[PDB]
Amino acid sequence: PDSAPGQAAVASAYQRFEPRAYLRNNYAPPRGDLCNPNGVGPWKLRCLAQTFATGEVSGRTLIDIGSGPTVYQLLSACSHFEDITMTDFLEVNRQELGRWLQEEPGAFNWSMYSQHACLIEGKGECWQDKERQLRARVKRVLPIDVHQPQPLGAGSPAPLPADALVSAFCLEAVSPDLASFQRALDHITTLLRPGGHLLLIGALEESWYLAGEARLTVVPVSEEEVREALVRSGYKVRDLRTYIMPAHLQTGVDDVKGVFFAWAQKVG
Amino acid sequence: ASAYQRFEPRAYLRNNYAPPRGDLCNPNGVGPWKLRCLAQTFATGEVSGRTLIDIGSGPTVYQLLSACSHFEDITMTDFLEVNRQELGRWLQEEPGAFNWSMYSQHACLIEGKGECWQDKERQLRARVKRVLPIDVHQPQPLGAGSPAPLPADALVSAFCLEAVSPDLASFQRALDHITTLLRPGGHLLLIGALEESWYLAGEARLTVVPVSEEEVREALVRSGYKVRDLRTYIMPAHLQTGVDDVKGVFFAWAQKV
Ligand SMILES: Nc1ncnc2c1ncn2[C@@H]1O[C@H](CSCC[C@H](N)C(=O)O)[C@@H](O)[C@H]1O
Ligand SMILES: Nc1ncnc2c1ncn2[C@@H]1O[C@H](CSCC[C@H](N)C(=O)O)[C@@H](O)[C@H]1O
Ligand SMILES: Oc1ccnc2ccccc12
Ligand SMILES: Oc1ccnc2ccccc12
């Protein structure tokens, strides 16, 4: 009933979120080992690539929900949208992205992800070009809070409503419980036009993960709880797949048991 | 022949394998075309065996990227010690080795097998058993007591013969010399400059014999090869850069018969 408390714990916890530690924990090897086809990184990129390869997900505007300090989730997307908004709750994540946008050396190096996306897209694109295009297409980086009824605030810059949403490992990671998760899904759904698509990636049955000193709390969800929430929010589920976390990728940075990928289309 | 003594490996690599010629992002460039020829050829599944020799390797490895997954024993060769050492440096992942990663990436890209570039380089480094001295002007280019397993199931050679031959007949002899290294039925992939007369390698100014596509064809036939394929890349203006005067690049797939 009372949402403020939980949301408050969440905002408090994320004050210690350390972008570099999170980058190290989830995007450096072994999880970041793009050479193993059976690994989670490759599975994620594959889900994204194949979905965009249908030609079915297009438009002018895309919004990435809770980008954090990562851009891989946009590698396959960025050829299908002119205008891309990135977003995060934390300024420090926003600056990280700033560093990559400016093509700075101190920036996290995504080039293995870029190359791998080029490889699986099968268009013989070099990664430098992929990166140049993503950089061109990211039109803004915005503060966001998915617990607000207007997640971007009122009279935001973002071209609304968007043609498509992307969101990876955000909702479940900032929702104390399932009902909060559902509301979070409801709030971002206001930003999507009817007939628009949502690509949702996330952890299955996770209760915690580490990002430096910060040990943050996650609502454990199942594939079925994810399908229901999507239906509940007004989506047709077009695709929902499950990756089971291999013991060797279960590194102690979290208690994640699997990863889900959902392609959902909002009812018009 | 004495000219090759001033040949600077890094200058040669700069002149030919760094941008603009080495910008792999442009599909119409010489780099991608070369890599395309190599990959398409091996993808046929018709060039295979246990052992392969790369003739006149210089300080470059890109010419074995697509090849290395069809041959378990690979021999690399060159006339200069400095080149052999430059190879050593990349094979052993020693410091200051040349960075071939862009090319590895692009072969993986072109090959379309979903292979990561690190796996590709790993396999290459593993299958290159030895780096050997060679002089194609010699009837036995490898010498007498070579560790190289003979005869080779296949040969590769890029930009060597024309660049070490004062004239057509020398070129022809050189081809004959390397052909004795190839098993009958075996395959040869020959890449090189068309209508080139000189190129620079730092302090070295090397003389080149200018050959035509049809001259290259006849040479292969005269050496007893059947020409399965011969393609020309015409040199765009923006890749004509003062380091030489080549007009085009040829690619030849020949079979000893
Ligand atoms: N109340 C809130 N509303 C929207 N995003 C939030 C939020 N609280 C935290 N976040 C952001 O949610 C992210 C979870 S980590 C996911 C990072 C990135 N999307 C990737 O795929 O790895 C963090 O970047 C965090 O700052
Ligand atoms: N007499 C000779 N016999 C065999 N190779 C020779 C030679 N004289 C010079 N070479 C080698 O021929 C090479 C020409 S350039 C290097 C070509 C390299 N394979 C690549 O594809 O770019 C030089 O490395 C040179 O050292
Ligand atoms: O790819 C990921 C990003 C963030 N968290 C993750 C947790 C488990 C497995 C993969 C993850
Ligand atoms: O790829 C090359 C290697 C050596 N010489 C070259 C001359 C012109 C164009 C390409 C070349």
UniProtKB/Swiss-Prot annotation, chain B:
InterPro entries referenced in this protein's UniProt entry, alphabetically: NNMT/PNMT/TEMT_CS, NNMT_TEMT_trans, SAM-dep_methyltransferase, SAM-dependent_MTases_sf
GO MF: phenylethanolamine N-methyltransferase activity
Phenotypic consequence of residue 162 to D: Strongly reduced enzyme activity towards phenylethanolamine. Decreases affinity for phenylethanolamine and S-adenosyl-L-methionine 3-fold
Keyword annotations of the record: Catecholamine biosynthesis, Methyltransferase, Phosphoprotein, S-adenosyl-L-methionine, Transferase
Catalytic activity: phenylethanolamine + S-adenosyl-L-methionine = N-methylphenylethanolamine + S-adenosyl-L-homocysteine + H(+); (R)-noradrenaline + S-adenosyl-L-methionine = (R)-adrenaline + S-adenosyl-L-homocysteine + H(+); (R)-normetanephrine + S-adenosyl-L-methionine = (R)-metanephrine + S-adenosyl-L-homocysteine + H(+); (R)-octopamine + S-adenosyl-L-methionine = (R)-synephrine + S-adenosyl-L-homocysteine + H(+)
Binding site for S-adenosyl-L-methionine: 12, 17, 56-57, 62, 78, 83, 135-136, 158
Gene3D superfamilies found in the cross-reference section: Vaccinia Virus protein VP39
Regulation: Inhibited by methyl methanethiosulfonate, phenylglyoxal, tetranitromethane and diethyl pyrocarbonate. Inhibited by 4-oxo-1,4-dihydro-quinoline-3,7-dicarboxylic acid, 4-(benzo[d][1,3]dioxol-5-ylamino)-4-oxobutanoic acid and 1,4-diaminonaphthalene-2,6-disulfonic acid.
Impact upon substituting residue 89 to C: No significant effect on protein expression and enzyme activity with octopamine as substrate
Pathway info: Catecholamine biosynthesis; (R)-adrenaline biosynthesis; (R)-adrenaline from (R)-noradrenaline: step 1/1
Enzyme Commission designation: 2.1.1.28
UniProt KW Iron keyword: no
Family stated for the protein in its record: Belongs to the class I-like SAM-binding methyltransferase superfamily. NNMT/PNMT/TEMT family.
NCBIfam families, A to Z: GntF_guanitoxin (NF041360)
Protein's UniProt name: Phenylethanolamine N-methyltransferase
